């Protein structure tokens, strides 16, 4: 069954270059055309590039013409996008998609074109008060770039979890909060650990959230 996995993303300085790779499985790679599509933050879907099975028909969007190059290694079941002379507006989530239809899309890989330095997050507990529903959380504060993944009890807790969209601060650093709501009488019965991962800074933190 169909698996598309994007990689090569992250932080890159303006003028810098990146090479994205999309590995594919569970279908005949050489029988389909492969698309790169991108999503600027809070904006809609933009087509970028397309390549036929034979690598004969290649098409680029006007925005990326001259700077980007698309290639496919049918042997390695891999689609590539070489991105040169990168600009701040190229900052977006990059997906590989299969066929004209767009029937299968990868998880997506985020590209941030910024002169700013990678900074790892500080994770701080949001401790529950004392009922009905009771709330606890983790404040993930002062990181760059996006994204951070937050889980609770290593994926064991999903019921009542809200991870909020990140906000950019005056510092030029991101902050988000993850909260979980539990029945008030279930406090100090279960253990609550927020697992924060910021790959761009090789930062993994497990913070225990206890009543204050």
């Amino acid at each position: 069954e169909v698996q598309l996995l994007e990689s090569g993303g992250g932080l890159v300085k303006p003028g810098g270059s990146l090479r994205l790779s999309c590995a594919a499985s569970g279908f005949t790679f050489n029988e389909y055309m492969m698309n790169w599509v991108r999503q600027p933050p809070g904006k809609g879907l933009e087509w970028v590039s397309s390549i036929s099975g034979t690598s004969t028909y290649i098409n680029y969007a006007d925005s990326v013409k001259g700077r980007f190059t698309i290639s496919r290694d049918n042997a390695k079941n891999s689609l590539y996008l070489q991105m040169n002379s990168l600009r701040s507006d190229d900052t977006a989530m990059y997906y590989c998609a299969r066929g004209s239809t767009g029937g299968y899309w990868g998880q997506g890989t985020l590209i941030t074109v910024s002169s700013a330095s990678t900074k790892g997050p500080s994770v701080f507990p949001l401790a529950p008060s004392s009922g009905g529903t009771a709330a606890l959380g983790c404040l993930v504060k002062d990181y760059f770039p996006e994204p951070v993944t937050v889980s609770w009890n290593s994926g064991a807790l999903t019921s009542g979890v809200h991870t909020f969209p990140a906000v950019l601060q005056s510092s030029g650093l991101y902050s988000l909060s993850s909260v979980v709501t539990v029945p008030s009488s279930s406090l100090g019965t279960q253990t609550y650990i927020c697992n924060v991962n910021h790959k761009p800074s090789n930062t993994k933190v497990d913070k225990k959230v206890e009543p204050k």
Binding site: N35, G44, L45, E46, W47, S50, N59, A61, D62, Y95, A97, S100, T101, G102, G103, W105, G106, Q107, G108, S122, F124, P125, L126, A127, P128, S129, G132, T133, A135, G137, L139, K141, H162, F164, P165, A166, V167, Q169, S175, L176, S177, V179, T181, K212
Partner: protein, 218 residues
């Protein structure tokens, strides 16, 4: 460059009621081979797109039968027979008949449910953070409808301005509610100059605004 104009931009529907999204092309969307390569995509926030309809009216495998695709020439329509809670998100038309490949700007499908009062919680800053010379107070509005909520920060009752940021969740796929976080940022010094910290919430589901507060240390 074929331009796709998607209408409406936002659509509020009652659960179990029909919904229609429209896409209009600048030119005719028929290929040399005679087929029309228009697609409809759904995107829940921070997830990849899923294909609903391809070639105007063909349901992709696993797509529920409540989704139907129609149109010819320039005018094309996605119709939902009865909207379910899971149908929230953004829908796109995509053209793949002529390059450049083009998409519509999107349509937010909102679910219209009964008014829900927010549950409000207030969190004082951690001791570990205060040692770093900054203080973050967080206010959480949880599982409320409609989306319009106002959060007012008070410090010993003094009304606060321009030292707070808000983040709102997307509409939940189950109970169709929103959640909101407000964060008041202060220096450790400023934080210690005051005793009583409160967030006051105004929402259509509360006749009088609700205040949660804590006393610093106590």
């Amino acid at each position: 460059d074929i331009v796709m104009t998607q209408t409406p931009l936002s659509s509020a529907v009652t659960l179990g009621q029909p919904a229609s999204i429209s896409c209009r092309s600048s030119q005719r969307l028929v290929h040399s081979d005679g087929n029309t390569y228009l697609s409809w995509l759904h995107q829940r926030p921070g997830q990849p797109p899923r294909l609903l309809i391809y070639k105007v009216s063909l349901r992709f495998s696993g797509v529920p039968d409540r989704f139907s695709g129609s149109g010819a020439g320039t005018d094309f329509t996605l119709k939902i027979s009865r909207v379910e809670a899971e149908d929230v998100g953004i829908y796109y038309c995509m053209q793949a008949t002529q390059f450049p490949l083009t998409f519509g700007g999107g349509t937010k499908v909102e679910i219209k449910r009964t008014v829900a009062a927010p549950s409000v919680f207030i969190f004082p800053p951690s001791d570990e953070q205060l040692k770093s010379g900054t203080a973050s107070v967080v206010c959480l509005l949880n599982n409320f409808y409609p989306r319009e909520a106002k959060v007012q920060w008070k410090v010993d009752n003094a009304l606060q301005s321009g030292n707070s940021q808000e983040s709102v969740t997307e509409q939940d796929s189950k109970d169709s509610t929103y959640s909101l976080s407000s964060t008041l940022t202060l220096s450790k010094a400023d934080y210690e100059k005051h005793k009583v910290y409160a967030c006051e919430v105004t929402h259509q589901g509360l006749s009088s605004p609700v205040t949660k507060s804590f006393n610093r240390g106590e």
